[PDB]
Amino acid sequence: ILYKTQGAVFIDSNGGAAVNNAYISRLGNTNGELEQAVYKPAGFTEVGDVAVTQFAGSEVKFNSPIIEQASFDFVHAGRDTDSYGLFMVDKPHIESSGGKKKHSFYLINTSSNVTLSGVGLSGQDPDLDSMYFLKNCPETARNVVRGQMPISGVKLVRGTGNYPTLVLDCTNMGSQFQFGEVGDIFYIKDVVGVKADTLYIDPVNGNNYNWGTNGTKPIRELTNIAKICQLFRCKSVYLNAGESVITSNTELPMVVFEGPGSLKANSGSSFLIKAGGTLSLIGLSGISTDGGHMFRVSTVEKVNIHTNCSVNAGAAYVVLSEVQGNIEYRQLFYSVNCSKYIGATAGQTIAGIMVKTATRPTGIDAAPVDGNVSLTYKII
Amino acid sequence: QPDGSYKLNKDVDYYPTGLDIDNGDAITCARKIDINNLNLITAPGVKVGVKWIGGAGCTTKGLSIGENTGSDITTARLPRVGLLQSASWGSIHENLRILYKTQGAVFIDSNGGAAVNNAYISRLGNTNGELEQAVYKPAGFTEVGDVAVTQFAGSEVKFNSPIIEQASFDFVHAGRDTDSYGLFMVDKPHIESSGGKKKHSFYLINTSSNVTLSGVGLSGQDPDLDSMYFLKNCPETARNVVRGQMPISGVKLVRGTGNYPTLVLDCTNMGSQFQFGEVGDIFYIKDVVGVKADTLYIDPVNGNNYNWGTNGTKPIRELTNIAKICQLFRCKSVYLNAGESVITSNTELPMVVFEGPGSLKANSGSSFLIKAGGTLSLIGLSGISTDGGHMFRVSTVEKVNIHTNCSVNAGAAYVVLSEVQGNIEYRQLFYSVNCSKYIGATAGQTIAGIMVKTATRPTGIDAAPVDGNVSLTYKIIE
């Protein structure tokens, strides 16, 4: 199909239908972005030519399509009632002159299974163009990505709606961590068979579009660092120079933090500890808060907090347990300031404390925790 | 031509590249060509059956090349190279049937979106097949032997359910020289060869791949050299993903060259490969999803490092990769068969239960390395000792528990040296222990708890069981 506005449109009942080795191309992409789709689901309101459009419950199988010069390679909506209609594309060969493109898979209220073949791109707008756009896909939906990412860097995903649905299933990422972008990490639901050792943060030069798992492409904010480390099984977080801040309670992953950066909780906010393990701050320029307790622990699992950097909780505590907790805190050298090292909101939390520095609130050597904490050991 | 004119190519070896088209150096005149059931036979010795050059969007169904003349291949009416294809994006070959002598089909340069569906490609028997020298092949492929399917220079043809028979090499595939572009894609290859003669099935050079195994295949008769996969210089960013079902008969999975592992087992149905097959070279496995094993078996006397190690009848021999192997297959324990399992350089131990009659030994001043939190348990072993180095070097800040229920001798060194600001609990149960300190640290404070429950211990350090860089949380002695 050589087309001007839309290549092929698939609507309503098409069960078991197949489209094999299609070759669908606009005649060049000049003014392609100004075409207006004629037959389209109500949820697709974007301007731009569309190679393949599918909606209203249609579930055609697309096997190895070649798609050329399109603003949108695929627009697919699930059925309005129940999101029925799986978007299925196996090894699409997607290309466009000058790298002009808006989205390759614009997916509305739907699930999908796509296998990439290493051929593809994202468009030139550094903000809006992405391989996937997930629009209002429901909580039970899954948009599964297998195969090989393009060799050249792309922005993977953007979306609207309250639920993540993108799944990386052993996706071959190539050099995307270094040269591409995730776009909006919010929309990734889970990741299988893809790992990275370290997440890089840079509050000055970082960019939140980045994956963050390659040092040349750090992210900027702390908002999603627990999510990202959980997804890619990161062992460390590296904080580049400057102050990494939160203004709302934010989870920290249980890993080693290193680098010249510092951590700051503002607006009365706290860092949240939600999983067992060890949190280590090693060699940072420091951590402090402007008035909230520093770490709020909401897990009953064994938590070790290891601070080898400057610590200042002011009038608040280094650790507040919101549950019946089990905590070991160790301060190594540098300095620490707080009214109590550890406290808890109710009836007992067991804790062990070591504070190895002369620069500490000496006056609480004899009473280092509030009444709701009982000590297993105290090494000061 | 030099003068700016154009002449029809009559050169047998010529094929156009994407570059040639763009330069204007070549213009394809092959559009709207369709083949349906053509049988092509050839006098013995003919170089090439079909040149599918520039055939973008052209299609084929039931194209048969080569005659099954008889048992003697040198006299058979078939070409040396069945099919040579380039610049044929969007072409489709259905039910291709090639009987060849040297190379079945060759795909080079731009073939974007091309498919080869249900091909049947076979040499006419494997007699002297190993001596065939491939004619059109990437520079990185220097081996001798016939090749059913060859692909290089950025060609990425989708192979759907091919049947490949009697080949020394089933597939030789190289990624593009500059950027490793060109995914090797084969869904369900049906691979057989008489007398089980074979070099490799997937010889992959500087490339990624996605292969779904269907349950039909083998590896060659050479016990050291023959393996299903050969991964030659695949880059750090490449992945060679293996899905589907392993062959019923044991095979050797993988060998390679280069410094980066790229093979991925993605819910691969291993069948009984742990018991009857071999990994070959564990170095080249990058990661494993949905494949598990409870126990890793080591046998310094009778083991073979080609083995998976996860079945008791096929233990591996050395300790070098036991941490890597336990991480991949999520092993819960390691069984040491009788004998001394030794290291001569610093080697990581997985945080699992070690049992069996074997002993562990660190020679040449080496140490066992503890790099992750959890519990390392040595239960009922014939002992662990070093010839002078610290026994366990801890480089993680996570909670580490060390539980030794066997004889322990670190000599003048420590049982545990923390190289970090550690958090260690050590317990010695019965048997005997010897060391200068149970726990020490390279620097500034490491918290520890210790229990030593045996009378055979260095009693002189009951009072100072750990060095000055370690602070005790509890101490249970006597």
Looking at the fold, whether B135 and B249 belong to one and the same domain comes out as yes
* Subunit contact A118:B57, Cβ cutoff 8 A: no
Q: By C-alpha distance, which of A286, A287, A261, A158 is closest to A206?
A: A261
* Subunit contact B208:A328, Cβ cutoff 8 A: no
And the tokens for A373? 């904490």
B136, B231, B174, B116 alpha-carbon torsion, rounded to 10°: 90
Compute the distance between CA of residue A311 and CA of residue A306 in angstroms, rounded to an integer: 11
SS3 A235: coil
Range of the domain at A249: 196-380
Residues 6+ apart with CB under 8 A from B445: A330, A332, A354, A356, B421, B469, B470, B471
Residues in A closer than 8 angstroms to B158, CB to CB, are 64, 91, 117
Q: Which residue has the tokens 């792309």?
A: A154
The gap from C-alpha A322 to its chain's centroid, in whole angstroms, comes to: 26
Is the separation of the CB atoms in B406 and B379 below 8 Å?
yes
Looking at the fold, whether B259 and B357 belong to one and the same domain comes out as no
Residues in B closer than 8 angstroms to A173, CB to CB, are 237
* Subunit contact A352:B473, Cβ cutoff 8 A: yes
Sign, CA dihedral A32-A38-A41-A43, equals: positive
* Subunit contact B113:A21, Cβ cutoff 8 A: yes
Looking at the fold, whether B269 and B355 belong to one and the same domain comes out as no
Looking at the fold, whether B86 and B209 belong to one and the same domain comes out as yes
- Adjacent-strand bridge partners of B429: B453
* Subunit contact B264:A193, Cβ cutoff 8 A: yes
* Subunit contact A193:B289, Cβ cutoff 8 A: yes
Q: By C-alpha distance, which of A258, A262, A225, A228 is closest to A245?
A: A262
* Subunit contact A175:B208, Cβ cutoff 8 A: no
CA angle A351, A355, A361 (to 5 degrees): 105
Looking at the fold, whether B237 and B327 belong to one and the same domain comes out as no
CA dist list (Å): B431 to A117, A131, A142, B412: 59, 62, 55, 19
Compute the distance between CA of residue B472 and CA of residue A91 in angstroms, rounded to an integer: 59
And the tokens for B76? 């058979």
**DSSP letter assigned to residue A218:** -
| Parallel, antiparallel or unpaired: strands A295-297 and A130-135 | unpaired
Q: List the single residue in B with minimal CA-CA distance to A90.
A: B158
Q: List the single residue in B with minimal CA-CA distance to A195.
A: B287
Q: List the single residue in A with minimal CA-CA distance to B472.
A: A379
Is the separation of the CB atoms in A199 and A212 below 8 Å?
yes
* Subunit contact B185:A151, Cβ cutoff 8 A: no
Per-position b or e across B394-430, b if 16+ CB within 10 A of its CB = bebbbbbbbbbbbbbbbeebbbbbbbbbbbbbbbbbe
Compute the distance between CA of residue B202 and CA of residue B262 in angstroms, rounded to an integer: 14
> Which CATH number goes with the domain that contains B394?
2.160.20.130
The gap from C-alpha A240 to its chain's centroid, in whole angstroms, comes to: 19
Is the separation of the CB atoms in A94 and A120 below 8 Å?
yes
* Subunit contact A306:B264, Cβ cutoff 8 A: no
Is the separation of the CB atoms in A307 and B398 below 8 Å?
no
CA atoms within 13 A on the CB side of A113: 9
Residues 6+ apart with CB under 8 A from B243: B210, B211, B212, B213, B266, B267, B268
Distance to chain B for A138, nearest Cα, Å: 27
- Adjacent-strand bridge partners of A377: A352
Phi, psi of A188 (to 5 degrees): -85, 120
| Parallel, antiparallel or unpaired: strands B423-429 and B285-289 | unpaired
With residue A131 as reference, give the H or E element that holds it. Answer: strand A130-135
CA dist list (Å): A65 to A197, A198, A357, B58, B112: 36, 37, 66, 16, 11
Q: By C-alpha distance, which of B359, B324, B357 is closest to B343?
A: B359
Residues in A closer than 8 angstroms to B151, CB to CB, are none
Compute the distance between CA of residue B299 and CA of residue B69 in angstroms, rounded to an integer: 52
**DSSP letter assigned to residue A125:** -
Q: Which residue has the tokens 């796509």?
A: A114
* Subunit contact A304:B399, Cβ cutoff 8 A: yes
Burial of B276 (0-12, 13-18, 19+ CB in 10 A): middle
Residues in A closer than 8 angstroms to B473, CB to CB, are 352, 376-377, 379
Strand segments (E) across A249-379: 250-251, 256-258, 262-265, 271-273, 277-282, 286-289, 295-297, 302-308, 311-312, 317-321, 326-332, 336-337, 340-344, 349-356, 373-379
Looking at the fold, whether B269 and B301 belong to one and the same domain comes out as no
Q: What is the resolution of this structure in A?
A: 1.8
Compute the distance between CA of residue A269 and CA of residue A302 in angstroms, rounded to an integer: 23
Q: How many domains does chain B have?
A: 2
Q: What is the 3-state secondary structure (H, E, C) of chain B?
A: CCCCCCCCCCCCCCCCCHHHHHHCCCCCCCCCCEEECCEECCCCCCCEEEEEECCCCCEEECCEECCCCCCCHHHCCCCCEEEEEECCCCCEEECCEEEECCEEEEEECCCCCCEEECCEEEECCCCCHHHCCCCCCCCCCCCCCCEEEEEECCCCCEEECCEEECCCEEEEEECCCCCCCCCEEEECCEEECHHHCCCEEEEEECCCEEEEEECCCCCCCCCCCCEEEEEECCCCCCCEEEEEECCCCCCEEEEEECCCCCEEEECCECCCHHHHCEEECHHHEEEEECCCCCEEEECCCCCCCCCCCCECCECECCCCCHHHHHHHHCCCEEEECCCEEEECCCEECCCCEEECCCEEEECCCCCEEECCCEEEEEECCCCEEECCCCCEEECCCCEEEEEEECCEECCCCCCEEECCCCEEEEEEECCEEECCCCEEECCCCEEEEEEEECCECCHHHCCCCECCCEEEEEEEEC
Looking at the fold, whether B244 and B315 belong to one and the same domain comes out as no
CA dist list (Å): A280 to A231, B146, B170, B196: 19, 57, 51, 55
* Subunit contact A302:B421, Cβ cutoff 8 A: no
Compute the distance between CA of residue B255 and CA of residue B417 in angstroms, rounded to an integer: 37
Sign, CA dihedral A273-A279-A280-A284, equals: negative
Is the separation of the CB atoms in B371 and B347 below 8 Å?
no
Q: Which residue has the tokens 């494993």?
A: B288
Residues in A closer than 8 angstroms to B210, CB to CB, are 115, 147-148, 172
- Would you give the end-to-end CA distance of chain B in angstroms? 96
Q: List the single residue in B with minimal CA-CA distance to A177.
A: B237
Residue in A118, A277, A379 nearest the CB of B183: A118
Residues in B closer than 8 angstroms to A282, CB to CB, are 397, 421
Q: What is the 3-state secondary structure (H, E, C) of B125-154?
A: CCCCHHHCCCCCCCCCCCCCCCEEEEEECC
Phi, psi of A36 (to 5 degrees): -115, 120
Looking at the fold, whether B165 and B39 belong to one and the same domain comes out as yes
Identity at A188, one-letter amino acid code: I
Residues 6+ apart with CB under 8 A from B408: B378, B383, B384, B385, B391, B415, B428, B431, B432, B433, B434, B435
Residues 6+ apart with CB under 8 A from A248: A267, A269
Residues in B closer than 8 angstroms to A175, CB to CB, are 237
* Subunit contact B208:A172, Cβ cutoff 8 A: yes
Phi, psi of A291 (to 5 degrees): 145, -20
Is the separation of the CB atoms in B120 and B163 below 8 Å?
yes
Q: Which residue has the tokens 């299988």?
A: A192
Phi, psi of A97 (to 5 degrees): -60, 135
Per-position b or e across A41-60, b if 16+ CB within 10 A of its CB = bebbebebbbbbbbbbbbbb
Residue in A21, A151, A379 nearest the CB of B181: A151
Q: List the single residue in A with minimal CA-CA distance to B112.
A: A93
Long-range contacts of B286-289 (CB under 8 A, 24+ apart): B286/B239, B286/B260, B286/B261, B286/B262, B287/A193, B287/A195, B287/B328, B288/B264, B288/B328, B288/B329, B289/A170, B289/A192, B289/A193, B289/B264, B289/B265
Compute the distance between CA of residue A252 and CA of residue B83 in angstroms, rounded to an integer: 58
Compute the distance between CA of residue B334 and CA of residue B318 in angstroms, rounded to an integer: 12
Q: By C-alpha distance, which of B177, B98, B80, B174 is closest to B135?
A: B80
Burial of A119 (0-12, 13-18, 19+ CB in 10 A): buried
* Subunit contact B237:A278, Cβ cutoff 8 A: no
SS3 A270: coil
In B, what residues contact A, Cβ < 8 A?
57, 89-90, 92, 112-113, 115, 156, 158, 179-183, 185, 208, 210, 237-239, 241, 264, 266, 287, 289, 373, 397-399, 421, 423, 444-445, 447, 471, 473-474
Distance to chain B for A377, nearest Cα, Å: 6
Residues in B closer than 8 angstroms to A91, CB to CB, are 158, 185
SS3 A8: strand
Residues 6+ apart with CB under 8 A from A362: none
* Subunit contact B423:A118, Cβ cutoff 8 A: no
Distance to chain A for B109, nearest Cα, Å: 15
With residue A177 as reference, give the H or E element that holds it. Answer: helix A176-179
Residues in B closer than 8 angstroms to A280, CB to CB, are 397
Question: Which phi-psi region, left, alpha or beta, contains residue A339 (left: φ > 0; alpha: ψ -120 to 50)?
Answer: alpha
Identity at A309, one-letter amino acid code: C
Question: Which of A148, A192, A333, A380 has the highest number of chain B CBs within 10 A, making it the mutation to test binding with B?
Answer: A148
* Subunit contact B447:A379, Cβ cutoff 8 A: yes
* Subunit contact B423:A195, Cβ cutoff 8 A: no
Residue in A66, A170, A376 nearest the CB of B264: A170
- Would you give the end-to-end CA distance of chain A in angstroms? 77
Is the separation of the CB atoms in B311 and B274 below 8 Å?
yes
Sheet holding B285-289, edge to edge: B34-36, B59-61, B92-94, B115-117, B158-160, B184-187, B209-214, B240-245, B263-266, B285-289
* Subunit contact A174:B210, Cβ cutoff 8 A: no
| Parallel, antiparallel or unpaired: strands B190-192 and B169-174 | unpaired
Residue in A95, A172, A304 nearest the CB of B423: A304
* Subunit contact A192:B90, Cβ cutoff 8 A: no
> Which CATH number goes with the domain that contains B254?
2.160.20.10
Residues 6+ apart with CB under 8 A from A132: A103, A104, A105, A106, A107, A143, A156, A157, A158, A159, A166, A187
Compute the distance between CA of residue A318 and CA of residue A252 in angstroms, rounded to an integer: 14
Q: List the single residue in A with minimal CA-CA distance to B262.
A: A172
Residues in B closer than 8 angstroms to A256, CB to CB, are 397
Q: List the single residue in A with minimal CA-CA distance to B237.
A: A174
Distance to chain A for B290, nearest Cα, Å: 10
Compute the distance between CA of residue A162 and CA of residue A224 in angstroms, rounded to an integer: 15
* Subunit contact A306:B421, Cβ cutoff 8 A: yes
Compute the distance between CA of residue B219 and CA of residue B225 in angstroms, rounded to an integer: 10
* Subunit contact B57:A356, Cβ cutoff 8 A: no
Is the separation of the CB atoms in A319 and A342 below 8 Å?
yes
Of B226, B260, B292, the one marking the end of a domain is: B292
SS3 A180: coil
Q: How many residues does chain B have?
A: 478
CA dist list (Å): A230 to A142, A171, A248, B173: 19, 17, 20, 36
And the tokens for A90? 């196996």
The gap from C-alpha B400 to its chain's centroid, in whole angstroms, comes to: 32
CA angle B235, A113, A5 (to 5 degrees): 100
SS3 A346: coil
| Parallel, antiparallel or unpaired: strands B423-429 and B399-405 | parallel
Of B259, B292, B325, the one marking the end of a domain is: B292
Looking at the fold, whether B226 and B325 belong to one and the same domain comes out as no
Sheet holding A295-297, edge to edge: A250-251, A271-273, A295-297, A317-321, A340-344
Looking at the fold, whether B288 and B361 belong to one and the same domain comes out as no
Q: By C-alpha distance, which of B103, B7, B109 is closest to B48?
A: B103
Distance to chain B for A43, nearest Cα, Å: 31
With residue A188 as reference, give the H or E element that holds it. Answer: strand A188-192
SS3 A178: helix
Residues 6+ apart with CB under 8 A from B171: B147, B148, B149, B150, B151, B159, B164, B184, B186, B189, B201, B202, B203, B204
Compute the distance between CA of residue A61 and CA of residue A15 in angstroms, rounded to an integer: 9
Is the separation of the CB atoms in A37 and A53 below 8 Å?
yes
* Subunit contact B398:A278, Cβ cutoff 8 A: yes
Q: List the single residue in B with minimal CA-CA distance to A92.
A: B113
**DSSP letter assigned to residue A90:** E
Looking at the fold, whether B25 and B83 belong to one and the same domain comes out as yes
* Subunit contact B183:A148, Cβ cutoff 8 A: yes
Q: List the single residue in B with minimal CA-CA distance to A328.
A: B423
Q: By C-alpha distance, which of B162, B163, B199, B207 is closest to B182?
A: B207
Question: Which phi-psi region, left, alpha or beta, contains residue B457 (left: φ > 0; alpha: ψ -120 to 50)?
Answer: beta
The gap from C-alpha A38 to its chain's centroid, in whole angstroms, comes to: 35
Phi, psi of B250 (to 5 degrees): -60, 140
Looking at the fold, whether B317 and B332 belong to one and the same domain comes out as yes
And the tokens for A350? 């067991």
Q: How many residues does chain A have?
A: 380
Burial of A230 (0-12, 13-18, 19+ CB in 10 A): middle
> A–B: how many Cβ contacts below 8 A?
104
- Adjacent-strand bridge partners of A147: A116
Q: List the single residue in B with minimal CA-CA distance to A171.
A: B239
Of B234, B258, B292, the one marking the end of a domain is: B292
Compute the distance between CA of residue B307 and CA of residue A204 in angstroms, rounded to an integer: 51
Compute the distance between CA of residue B205 and CA of residue B189 in angstroms, rounded to an integer: 19
The gap from C-alpha B205 to its chain's centroid, in whole angstroms, comes to: 13
Sign, CA dihedral A261-A266-A270-A273, equals: negative
Compute the distance between CA of residue B238 and CA of residue A151 in angstroms, rounded to an integer: 10
Residues 6+ apart with CB under 8 A from A249: A269, A270, A271, A272, A296
Compute the distance between CA of residue B464 and CA of residue B437 in angstroms, rounded to an integer: 8
Sign, CA dihedral B242-B245-B247-B249, equals: positive
CA dist list (Å): A218 to A98, A215, A252, A258, B271: 27, 6, 17, 14, 43
Phi, psi of B426 (to 5 degrees): -120, 135
Compute the distance between CA of residue A130 and CA of residue A121 in angstroms, rounded to an integer: 8
